[PDB]
Design a protein around this ligand. Structure first.
Ligand SMILES: Nc1ncnc2c1ncn2[C@@H]1O[C@H](COP(=O)(O)OP(=O)(O)OP(=O)(O)O)[C@@H](O)[C@H]1O
Ligand SMILES: Nc1ncnc2c1ncn2[C@@H]1O[C@H](COP(=O)(O)OP(=O)(O)OP(=O)(O)O)[C@@H](O)[C@H]1O
Ligand SMILES: Nc1ncnc2c1ncn2[C@@H]1O[C@H](COP(=O)(O)OP(=O)(O)O)[C@@H](O)[C@H]1O
Ligand SMILES: [Mg+2]
Ligand SMILES: [Mg+2]
Lengths: 186, 171, 177
């Protein structure tokens, strides 16, 4: 095998080329790569910072999905999946129109409330198809641990980021459609 | 020297200078790449980031102190008059903080937006510090490496006399 | 070494020393970057900061104390007579003594303000806390030392700020429990 540091450094730089890395993020990556070379191959600190390198590069920096800004097409997706729910569908269509006039993608905070079994959790997947956004679901019912969202500090053995960060790595775009289910039961 | 060239641009207290001076002494011997070799730079950078002796002129006037209020907000004649009373007594007293000001009223009436207008009135640096839940070590107490929000407030405003608004104290 | 020096002037009871001595050994065997090391450091800092055997120098002269009370407030002869009697009792005893007193009356009359005048007449240290509609017993006695980010009780916090074991403690709204 070749030099581990050179292969590790070069492969991590390959992932950063496609992304739009913020300046402060790029400085953090650069400084930790400097200490990666000086550390030993089998050292524990080397493995701790290697995972830190992998997580940072895995985050989609300045990457957004190609949303479907077509009112005619968005309606067709919504009606085929579900019946009725005009108030939800009209709000979604108006959200699409605003994004067109603004000329750029935008994020909104929406909450659907009502009796059980009316289609709240099932319309969320349909909305993602209409908006061409990748869909992620996470329920907060009976949730008592804060580290699920914010993760654990890198110093802890086996520490991992929060699943919101794991959401971005799996979604691979900075514009997901995260469904926070059962907010009233936190 | 880059840290020192920033340090010499502003007045540094002697008590803090000795603490700052010893931090450079340790950092030179460190390899700058470790858990403790990086916190010293973080400790030192946060020190030099804090302003000392740098301030914005306060209480510019009373004629155009009002003029900021009318073009920023409508109505609130009694509230606006009360602020000018607080500004007038502050100038005579010669002290910035005389007593704590609080505003209570129906939600969404404009109390939060007043503070931004107030900062522009007497040339302060606005900073909102709202709390939703009460937790001891969460917002002021910090850690140890997470510096307290008050310390972070001065760094981002680059002044010794900013304006900090505490919002929703009851909740 | 620094914390041992800061206990030199205080008159520490024996049960205080053994707790301090045993925590010093625990602090010695710990590590600098340990979470419980900070807890041990925080706990040991509070113990030494609390004054032990330190009493503020009282004022035991009726003439000057009466003059001080008259200038601060108008009327309140019933309160003033009790305070003058309080000082005279301390002279016969030869040592400082404490009492529990209650001031009840209409709001805004001067119940809170007179106590501040009392502290200056007696050369004591003034500390105030309110119990209007108390809900948590943790205010008086703090939280347990094992809890993360725990703090001592407000009374214990009073000795730290007053730096004496003979302060004047004020309680507000005992009729609004
Ligand atoms: N308008 C509708 N058209 C078609 N299917 C529907 C409609 N409303 C609900 N459904 C279907 O009925 C079921 C309702 O489950 P769903 O999770 O959507 O309900 P919910 O409102 O989230 O309930 P809960 O509050 O208990 O979570 C799903 O199969 C959903 O697809
Ligand atoms: N008198 C006014 N003149 C101009 N704009 C106003 C006025 N009152 C309210 N507004 C507008 O309404 C907005 C809502 O007010 P604001 O957010 O300050 O309310 P608040 O009292 O801080 O709310 P909360 O109770 O939620 O903390 C303001 O940001 C401002 O844009
Ligand atoms: N006899 C007095 N002499 C001087 N000041 C007084 C007198 N009575 C009341 N005051 C003033 O009025 C205020 C009364 O408020 P306070 O006594 O704190 O309210 P409360 O009686 O509800 O505790 C004090 O600030 C005090 O300065
Ligand atoms: Mg559901
Ligand atoms: Mg507000």
């Amino acid at each position: 095998e070749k030099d581990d540091k050179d292969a590790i450094e070069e492969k991590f730089r390959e992932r950063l080329k496609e992304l739009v890395v913020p300046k402060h993020v790029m400085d953090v990556v650069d400084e930790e790569l400097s200490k990666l070379g000086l550390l030993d191959n089998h050292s524990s600190e080397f493995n701790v910072t290697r995972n830190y390198l992998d997580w940072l590069t895995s985050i989609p920096w300045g990457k957004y999905s190609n949303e479907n800004l077509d009112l005619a097409r968005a309606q067709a997706v919504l009606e085929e999946d579900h019946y009725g729910m005009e108030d939800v569908k009209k709000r979604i269509l108006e959200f699409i129109a605003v994004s067109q006039l603004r000329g750029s993608t935008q994020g909104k905070i929406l909450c659907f409330y009502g009796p059980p079994g009316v289609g709240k959790t099932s319309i969320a997947r349909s909305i993602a198809r209409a908006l061409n956004r990748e869909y992620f679901r996470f329920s907060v019912g009976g949730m008592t641990d804060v580290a699920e969202i914010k993760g654990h500090r890198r110093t802890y053995v086996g520490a991992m980021p929060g699943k919101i960060i794991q959401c971005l790595k799996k979604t691979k775009t900075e514009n997901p459609l995260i469904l926070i289910d059962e907010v009233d039961k936190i």
